[PDB]
CSV table of C-alpha atoms (C1' of nucleotides) in Angstrom, one decimal:
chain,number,residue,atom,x,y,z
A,155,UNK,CA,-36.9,76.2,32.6
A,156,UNK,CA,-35.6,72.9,30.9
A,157,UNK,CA,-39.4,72.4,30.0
A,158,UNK,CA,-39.6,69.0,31.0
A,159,UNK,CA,-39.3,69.5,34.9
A,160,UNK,CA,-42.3,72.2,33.7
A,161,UNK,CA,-44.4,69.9,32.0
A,162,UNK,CA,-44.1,67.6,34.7
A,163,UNK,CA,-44.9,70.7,37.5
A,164,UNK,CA,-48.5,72.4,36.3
A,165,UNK,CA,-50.9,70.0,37.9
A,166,UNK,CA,-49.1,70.9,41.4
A,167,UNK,CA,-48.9,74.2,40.5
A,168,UNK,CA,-52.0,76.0,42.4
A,169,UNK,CA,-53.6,78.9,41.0
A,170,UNK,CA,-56.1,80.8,42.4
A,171,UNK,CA,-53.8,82.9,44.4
A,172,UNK,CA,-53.8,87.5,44.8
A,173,UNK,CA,-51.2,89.5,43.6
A,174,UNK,CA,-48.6,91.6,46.1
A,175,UNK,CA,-44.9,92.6,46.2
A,176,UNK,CA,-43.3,93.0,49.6
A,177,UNK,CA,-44.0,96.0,51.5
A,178,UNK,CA,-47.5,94.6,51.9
A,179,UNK,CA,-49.5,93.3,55.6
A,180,UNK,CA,-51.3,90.2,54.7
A,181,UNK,CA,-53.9,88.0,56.5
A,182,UNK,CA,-52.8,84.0,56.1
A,183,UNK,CA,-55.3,81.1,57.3
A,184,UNK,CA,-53.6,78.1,57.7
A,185,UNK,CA,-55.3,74.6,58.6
A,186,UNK,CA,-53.8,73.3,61.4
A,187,UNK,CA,-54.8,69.9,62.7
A,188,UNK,CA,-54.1,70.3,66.2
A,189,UNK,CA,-57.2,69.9,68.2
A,190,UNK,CA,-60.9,67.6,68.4
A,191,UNK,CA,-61.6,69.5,65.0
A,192,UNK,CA,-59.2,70.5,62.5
A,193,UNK,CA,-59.3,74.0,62.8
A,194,UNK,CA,-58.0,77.0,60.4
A,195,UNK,CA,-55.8,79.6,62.8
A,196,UNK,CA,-55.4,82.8,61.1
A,197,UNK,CA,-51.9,84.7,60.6
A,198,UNK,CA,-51.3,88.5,60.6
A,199,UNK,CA,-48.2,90.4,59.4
A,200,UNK,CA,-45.7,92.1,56.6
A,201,UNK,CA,-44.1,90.4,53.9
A,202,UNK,CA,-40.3,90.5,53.9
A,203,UNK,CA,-39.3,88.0,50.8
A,204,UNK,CA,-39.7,86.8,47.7
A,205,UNK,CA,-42.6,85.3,45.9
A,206,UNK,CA,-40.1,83.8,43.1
A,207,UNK,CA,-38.1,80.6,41.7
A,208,UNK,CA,-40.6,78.2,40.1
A,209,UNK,CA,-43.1,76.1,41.6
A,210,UNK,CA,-40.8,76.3,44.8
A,211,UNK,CA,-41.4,80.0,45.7
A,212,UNK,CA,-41.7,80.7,49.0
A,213,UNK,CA,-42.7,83.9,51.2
A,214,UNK,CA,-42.1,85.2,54.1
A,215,UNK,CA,-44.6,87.2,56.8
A,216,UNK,CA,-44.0,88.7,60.6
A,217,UNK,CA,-45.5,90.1,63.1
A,218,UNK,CA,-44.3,91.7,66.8
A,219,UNK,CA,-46.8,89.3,68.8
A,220,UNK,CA,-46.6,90.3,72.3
A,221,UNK,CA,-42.8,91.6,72.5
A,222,UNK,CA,-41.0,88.8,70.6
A,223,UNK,CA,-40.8,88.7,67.1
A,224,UNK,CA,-42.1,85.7,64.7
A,225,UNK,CA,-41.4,85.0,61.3
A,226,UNK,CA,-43.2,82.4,59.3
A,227,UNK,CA,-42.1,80.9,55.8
A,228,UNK,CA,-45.1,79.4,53.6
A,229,UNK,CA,-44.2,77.7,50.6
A,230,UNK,CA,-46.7,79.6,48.1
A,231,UNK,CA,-48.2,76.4,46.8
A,232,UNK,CA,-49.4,74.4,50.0
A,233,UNK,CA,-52.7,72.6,50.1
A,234,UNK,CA,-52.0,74.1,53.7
A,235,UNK,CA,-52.9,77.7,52.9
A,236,UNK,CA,-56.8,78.0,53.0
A,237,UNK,CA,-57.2,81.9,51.4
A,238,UNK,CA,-54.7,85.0,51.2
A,239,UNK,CA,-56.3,88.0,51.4
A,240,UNK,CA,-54.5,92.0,51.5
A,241,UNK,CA,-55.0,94.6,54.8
A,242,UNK,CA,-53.0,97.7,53.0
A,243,UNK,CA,-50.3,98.8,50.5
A,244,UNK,CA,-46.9,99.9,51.0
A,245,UNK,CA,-44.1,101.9,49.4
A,246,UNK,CA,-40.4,100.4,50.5
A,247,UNK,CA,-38.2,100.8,47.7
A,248,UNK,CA,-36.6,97.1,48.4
A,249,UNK,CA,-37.0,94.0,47.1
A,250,UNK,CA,-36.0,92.0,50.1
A,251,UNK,CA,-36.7,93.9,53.8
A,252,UNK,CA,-34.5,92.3,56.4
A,253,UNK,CA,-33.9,96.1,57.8
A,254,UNK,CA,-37.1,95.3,59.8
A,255,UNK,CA,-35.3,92.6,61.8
A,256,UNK,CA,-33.9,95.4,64.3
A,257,UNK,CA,-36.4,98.2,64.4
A,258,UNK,CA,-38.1,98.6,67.4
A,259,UNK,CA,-41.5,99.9,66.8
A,260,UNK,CA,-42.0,103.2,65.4
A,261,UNK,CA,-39.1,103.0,63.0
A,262,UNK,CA,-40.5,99.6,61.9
A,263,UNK,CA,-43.3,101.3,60.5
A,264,UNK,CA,-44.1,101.8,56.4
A,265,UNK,CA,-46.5,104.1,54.9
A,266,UNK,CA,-49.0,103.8,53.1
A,267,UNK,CA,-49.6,104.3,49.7
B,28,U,C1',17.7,102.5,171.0
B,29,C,C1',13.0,99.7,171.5
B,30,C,C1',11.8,93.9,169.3
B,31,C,C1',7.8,89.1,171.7
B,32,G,C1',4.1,93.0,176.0
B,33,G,C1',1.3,97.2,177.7
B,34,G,C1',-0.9,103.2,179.7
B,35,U,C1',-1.5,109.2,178.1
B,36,C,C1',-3.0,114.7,175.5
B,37,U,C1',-2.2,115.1,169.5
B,38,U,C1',-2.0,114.2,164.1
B,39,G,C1',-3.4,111.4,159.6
B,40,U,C1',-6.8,107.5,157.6
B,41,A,C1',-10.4,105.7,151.2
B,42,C,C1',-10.1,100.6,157.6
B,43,A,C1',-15.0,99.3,161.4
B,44,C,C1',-14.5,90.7,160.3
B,45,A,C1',-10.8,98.5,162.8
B,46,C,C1',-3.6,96.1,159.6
B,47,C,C1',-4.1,88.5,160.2
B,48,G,C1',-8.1,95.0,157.6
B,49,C,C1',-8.7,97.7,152.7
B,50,C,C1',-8.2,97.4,147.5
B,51,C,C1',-5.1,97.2,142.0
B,52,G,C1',-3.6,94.9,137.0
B,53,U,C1',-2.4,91.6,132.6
B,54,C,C1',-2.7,86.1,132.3
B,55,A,C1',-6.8,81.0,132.5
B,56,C,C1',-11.9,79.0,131.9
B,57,A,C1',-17.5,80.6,131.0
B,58,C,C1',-21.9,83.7,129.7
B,59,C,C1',-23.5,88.4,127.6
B,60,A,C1',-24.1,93.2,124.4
B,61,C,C1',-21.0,96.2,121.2
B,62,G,C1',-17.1,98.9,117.4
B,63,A,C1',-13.6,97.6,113.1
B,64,G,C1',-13.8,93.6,109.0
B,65,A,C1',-12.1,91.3,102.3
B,66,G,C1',-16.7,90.5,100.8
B,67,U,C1',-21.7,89.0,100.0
B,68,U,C1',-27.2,90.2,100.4
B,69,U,C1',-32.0,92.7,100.8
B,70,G,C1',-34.5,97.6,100.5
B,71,U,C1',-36.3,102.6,100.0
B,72,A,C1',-36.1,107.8,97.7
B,73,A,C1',-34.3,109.9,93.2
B,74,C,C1',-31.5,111.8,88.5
B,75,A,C1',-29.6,110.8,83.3
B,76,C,C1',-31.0,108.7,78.4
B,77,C,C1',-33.6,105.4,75.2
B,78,C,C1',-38.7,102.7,74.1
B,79,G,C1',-44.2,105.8,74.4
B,80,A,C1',-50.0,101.7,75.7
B,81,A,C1',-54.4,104.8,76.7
B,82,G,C1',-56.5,110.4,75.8
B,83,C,C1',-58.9,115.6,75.2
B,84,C,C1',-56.3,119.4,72.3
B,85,G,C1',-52.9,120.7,67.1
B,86,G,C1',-52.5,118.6,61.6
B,87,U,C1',-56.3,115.6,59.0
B,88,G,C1',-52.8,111.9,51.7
B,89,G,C1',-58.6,110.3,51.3
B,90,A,C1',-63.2,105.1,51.0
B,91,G,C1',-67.9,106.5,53.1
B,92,U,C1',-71.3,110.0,54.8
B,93,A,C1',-79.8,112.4,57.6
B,94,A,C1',-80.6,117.8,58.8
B,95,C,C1',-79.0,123.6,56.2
B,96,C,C1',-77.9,126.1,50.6
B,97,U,C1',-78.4,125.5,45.1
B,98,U,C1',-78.3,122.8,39.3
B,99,U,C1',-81.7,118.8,44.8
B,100,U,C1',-81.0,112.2,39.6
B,101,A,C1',-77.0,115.2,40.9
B,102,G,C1',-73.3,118.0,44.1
B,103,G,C1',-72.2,120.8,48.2
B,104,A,C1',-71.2,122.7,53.6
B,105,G,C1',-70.5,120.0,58.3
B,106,C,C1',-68.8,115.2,60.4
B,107,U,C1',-66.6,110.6,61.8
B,108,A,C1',-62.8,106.7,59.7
RNA sequence: UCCCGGGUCUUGUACACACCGCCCGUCACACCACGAGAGUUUGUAACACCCGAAGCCGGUGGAGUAACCUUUUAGGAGCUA
């Protein structure tokens, strides 16, 4: 980038992080702090967008939790995020999947690979 | 000729406080049940199409896998995911 922004960016700039491209159902645990401890509440769903931009990348996971629909941005660096860990592999063709946002249940499905 | 009065055979009467009788119909006030009434509201029995949780059966991309066969260190047949 302009390479002093990036010099300035690398000690926030977490690293320990897997590898995916949408098309894949992930399994977040966040830390929450809302309770007597300060528990870690796990997240379960597909990844729609992008995992790109910087030290500013965001993505984007849902799930169908009991009829409505959820989405859930993270922004990829968070001290927030405990560990990201990968349930399967998909095949989508797409680089962004917002086609998911009106398919019901059987059309929102994706193969494996 | 019969009116304020009366006596005889007969007819007709839905009257017998026997004509100063008997009963008929809207209007007025009051109770009571009902049909029509723009709508509104609660129910049952279904049909049409879309979404298909379980669950045996039909098909099993492939990670694993005691029995039986052989090269048995191995593989393999058969299974469940």
């Amino acid at each position: 980038n302009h390479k002093l922004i990036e010099a300035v960016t690398k000690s926030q700039l977490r690293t320990d992080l897997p590898s995916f491209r949408p098309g894949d159902t992930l399994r977040v645990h966040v830390r929450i702090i809302e309770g007597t401890r300060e528990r870690i509440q796990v997240f379960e769903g597909v990844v729609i967008k992008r995992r790109g931009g910087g030290v500013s990348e965001t993505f984007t996971v849902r799930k169908i939790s009991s009829g409505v629909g959820v989405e859930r941005t993270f922004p990829l660096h968070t001290p927030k995020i405990e560990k990201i860990e990968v349930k399967r592999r998909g095949k989508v063709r797409r680089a962004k999947l917002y086609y998911l946002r009106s398919l019901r249940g059987k059309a929102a499905r994706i193969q494996e690979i």
